[PDB]
Amino acid sequence: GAMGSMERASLIQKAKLAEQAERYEDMAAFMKGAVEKGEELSCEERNLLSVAYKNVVGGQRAAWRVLSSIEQKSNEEGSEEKGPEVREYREKVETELQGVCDTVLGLLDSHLIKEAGDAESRVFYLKMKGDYYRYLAEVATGDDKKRIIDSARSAYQEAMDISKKEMPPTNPIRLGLALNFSVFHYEIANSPEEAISLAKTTFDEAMADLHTLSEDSYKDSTLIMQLLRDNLTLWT
Amino acid sequence: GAMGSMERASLIQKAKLAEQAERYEDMAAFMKGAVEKGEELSCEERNLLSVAYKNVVGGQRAAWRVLSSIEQKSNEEGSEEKGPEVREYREKVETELQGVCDTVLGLLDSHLIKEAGDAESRVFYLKMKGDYYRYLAEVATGDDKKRIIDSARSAYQEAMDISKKEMPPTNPIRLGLALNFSVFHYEIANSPEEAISLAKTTFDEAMADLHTLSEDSYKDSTLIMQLLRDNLTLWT
Amino acid sequence: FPATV
Amino acid sequence: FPATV
Numbered sequence: 001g002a003m004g005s006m007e008r009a010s011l012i013q014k015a016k017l018a019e020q021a022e023r024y025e026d027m028a029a030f031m032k033g034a035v036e037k038g039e040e041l042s043c044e045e046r047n048l049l050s051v052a053y054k055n056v057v058g059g060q061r062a063a064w065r066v067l068s069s070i071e072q073k074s075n076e077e078g079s080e081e082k083g084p085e086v087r088e089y090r091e092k093v094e095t096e097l098q099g100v101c102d103t104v105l106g107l108l109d110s111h112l113i114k115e116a117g118d119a120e121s122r123v124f125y126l127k128m129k130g131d132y133y134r135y136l137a138e139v140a141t142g143d144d145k146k147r148i149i150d151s152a153r154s155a156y157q158e159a160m161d162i163s164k165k166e167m168p169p170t171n172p173i174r175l176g177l178a179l180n181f182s183v184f185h186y187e188i189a190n191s192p193e194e195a196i197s198l199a200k201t202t203f204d205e206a207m208a209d210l211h212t213l214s215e216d217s218y219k220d221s222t223l224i225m226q227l228l229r230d231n232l233t234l235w236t
Numbered sequence: 237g238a239m240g241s242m243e244r245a246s247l248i249q250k251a252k253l254a255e256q257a258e259r260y261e262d263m264a265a266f267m268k269g270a271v272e273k274g275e276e277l278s279c280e281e282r283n284l285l286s287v288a289y290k291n292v293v294g295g296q297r298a299a300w301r302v303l304s305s306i307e308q309k310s311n312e313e314g315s316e317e318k319g320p321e322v323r324e325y326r327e328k329v330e331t332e333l334q335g336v337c338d339t340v341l342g343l344l345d346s347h348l349i350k351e352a353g354d355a356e357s358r359v360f361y362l363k364m365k366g367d368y369y370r371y372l373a374e375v376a377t378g379d380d381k382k383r384i385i386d387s388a389r390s391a392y393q394e395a396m397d398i399s400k401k402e403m404p405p406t407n408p409i410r411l412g413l414a415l416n417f418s419v420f421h422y423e424i425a426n427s428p429e430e431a432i433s434l435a436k437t438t439f440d441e442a443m444a445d446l447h448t449l450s451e452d453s454y455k456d457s458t459l460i461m462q463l464l465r466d467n468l469t470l471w472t
Numbered sequence: 473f474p475a476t477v
Numbered sequence: 478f479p480a481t482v
């Protein structure tokens with residue numbers, strides 16, 4: 001790997017610089033290098049990894065959606081034939097996106113998840129696994145589409161089970177996991193009722209636990225609770 | 237070149253798709269491929285080329301400025317020593333930026349400028365040459381810094397001479413060239429009075445020619461005139 | 473599109 | 478920073 005010669009601490013330092021410079025591809029490459037050193041990641045380091053790849057894949061997803069929309073319009077009645085270029089370029093972006101997802105899933109499988117024993121790390125990584133299978137599912141159209149969806153579901157479900165047992169209902173990782181699994185239900189699994197039920201239950205159980213929190217913890221939990229509310233408003 | 241097997245028209249089509257998807261690195265690569273087909277570029281095609289590389293280098297410049305600022309702060313009295321990482325990463329971004337500038341200048345030299353005979357094409361390309369030498373000058377600190385600055389000046393000056401002879405004072409290429417050469421004077425050549433004089437004269441001569449224009453031409457010229465005014469307001 | 477984190 | 482186009 002190209003980062004093999006750089007110190008772990010230097011990779012982390014440069015990931016933080018890349019973030020400040022909004023150089024998310026660089027940030028992701030630095031954090032991949034850090035993971036490949038073989039040591040477990042701290043809370044801060046896990047969040048550098050997630051932020052980096054979230055931004056990279058987020059840009060790819062936005063581009064893919066633009067191109068998919070153009071492609072869909074090209075296949076409507078009355079649309080003039082413009083040749084293979086739209087499909088080709090959508091496929092190019094799609095392949096790049098799948099590559100990033102596969103890279104992230106590869107890091108999780110080799111060997112972040114298996115060494116993650118604490119709830120906060122294990123749930124975090126399983127949430128990531130669910131998310132990146134979800135992104136693969138967004139672009140899947142073939143024989144393995146059902147299996148990709150089930151891979152996302154399975155990762156989310158394991159994360160949910162651990163989070164319910166080991167974390168308070170206001171824990172931000174627990175809340176974010178539930179937010180995203182709810183979106184999985186609505187957007188991927190064709191299960192809007194499950195999505196709504198999960199968002200509502202999550203919100204209500206968090207509300208009941210807010211009284212236990214400091215001001216700073218309250219702030220962070222309520223931010224994610226508002227996102228649950230926003231989705232519920234969108235869906236009802 | 238990786239685009240050698242793709243049709244010129246397909247490269248142009250995909251450049252436009254990349255723009256819609258805000259995939260400016262892709263857009264630039266497609267337009268580089270189009271240039272390397274060896275045919276002259278139309279007005280629309282020249283502007284696809286400029287837009288693509290402007291966005292790529294614009295992002296690099298923004299990142300370079302962030303990192304340079306951090307580096308400068310690290311060399312202040314009382315700043316803790318954090319090792320070579322800030323310098324290294326600033327150098328990485330800088331080298332990437334120089335690479336893009338060299339790529340653009342390479343396309344202009346091989347062979348866009350030499351085949352450009354009409355004022356609108358020749359001035360456009362010479363403006364680009366001035367701009368990309370200006371971006372090289374922004375990061376230059378060595379023995380060739382003066383020569384880089386003079387390369388920018390020389391390209392801008394040739395463009396100015398042609399534009400004054402061959403274009404009306406409201407021509408958007410002429411106006412944009414003058415805007416940018418004025419910024420060159422202020423920010424690169426340590427010549428704020430020249431910058432101000434050029435912006436004012438350009439603005440006033442354009443104002444006097446607006447009466448000749450259609451509504452649409454008026455709109456486009458006045459947009460750039462407002463940028464001249466904005467800079468004058470900043471500088472006075 | 474719905475919110476995710 | 479000043480405006481350029």
Ligand SMILES: *CC(=O)Nc1ccc(-c2nc3ccccn3c2NCc2ccccc2F)cc1
Pocket residue numbers: 043044046047050120124127172173174175176177220223224477
């Ligand atoms: C140790 C650890 O992981 N702690 C942690 C992770 C994430 C957050 C967090 N809070 C908020 C509030 C509002 C928006 C975004 N966040 C984040 N980051 C995104 C994120 C990532 C994973 C799980 C949940 C989640 F929200 C706070 C503390």
Ligand SMILES: *CC(=O)Nc1ccc(-c2nc3ccccn3c2NCc2ccccc2F)cc1
Pocket residue numbers: 279280282283286356360363408409410411412413456459460482
């Ligand atoms: C054929 C040709 O080149 N025509 C042309 C080029 C550029 C513009 C133009 N008008 C405006 C108004 C406001 C902002 C930006 N623009 C552009 N594009 C940027 C640009 C590039 C090169 C020279 C000048 C310039 F403004 C219109 C018509």
Ligand SMILES: [Ca+2]
Pocket residue numbers: 007008
């Ligand atoms: Ca070491």
Ligand SMILES: [Ca+2]
Pocket residue numbers: 082083084085246249
């Ligand atoms: Ca075509």
Ligand SMILES: [Ca+2]
Pocket residue numbers: 091094095
């Ligand atoms: Ca595909």
Ligand SMILES: [Ca+2]
Pocket residue numbers: 040115116117118
């Ligand atoms: Ca462990």
Ligand SMILES: [Ca+2]
Pocket residue numbers: 119166167168
């Ligand atoms: Ca616990």
Ligand SMILES: [Ca+2]
Pocket residue numbers: 233234235236
């Ligand atoms: Ca609604």
Ligand SMILES: [Ca+2]
Pocket residue numbers: 243244
């Ligand atoms: Ca051909």
Ligand SMILES: [Ca+2]
Pocket residue numbers: 010013318319320321
């Ligand atoms: Ca260091």
Ligand SMILES: [Ca+2]
Pocket residue numbers: 327330331
């Ligand atoms: Ca250098």
Ligand SMILES: [Ca+2]
Pocket residue numbers: 276351352353354
């Ligand atoms: Ca010619």
Ligand SMILES: [Ca+2]
Pocket residue numbers: 355402403404
């Ligand atoms: Ca003329």
Ligand SMILES: [Ca+2]
Pocket residue numbers: 469470471472
């Ligand atoms: Ca002022």
Ligand SMILES: [Cl-]
Pocket residue numbers: 088089092250
């Ligand atoms: Cl393509």
Ligand SMILES: [Cl-]
Pocket residue numbers: 014324325328
């Ligand atoms: Cl580096």
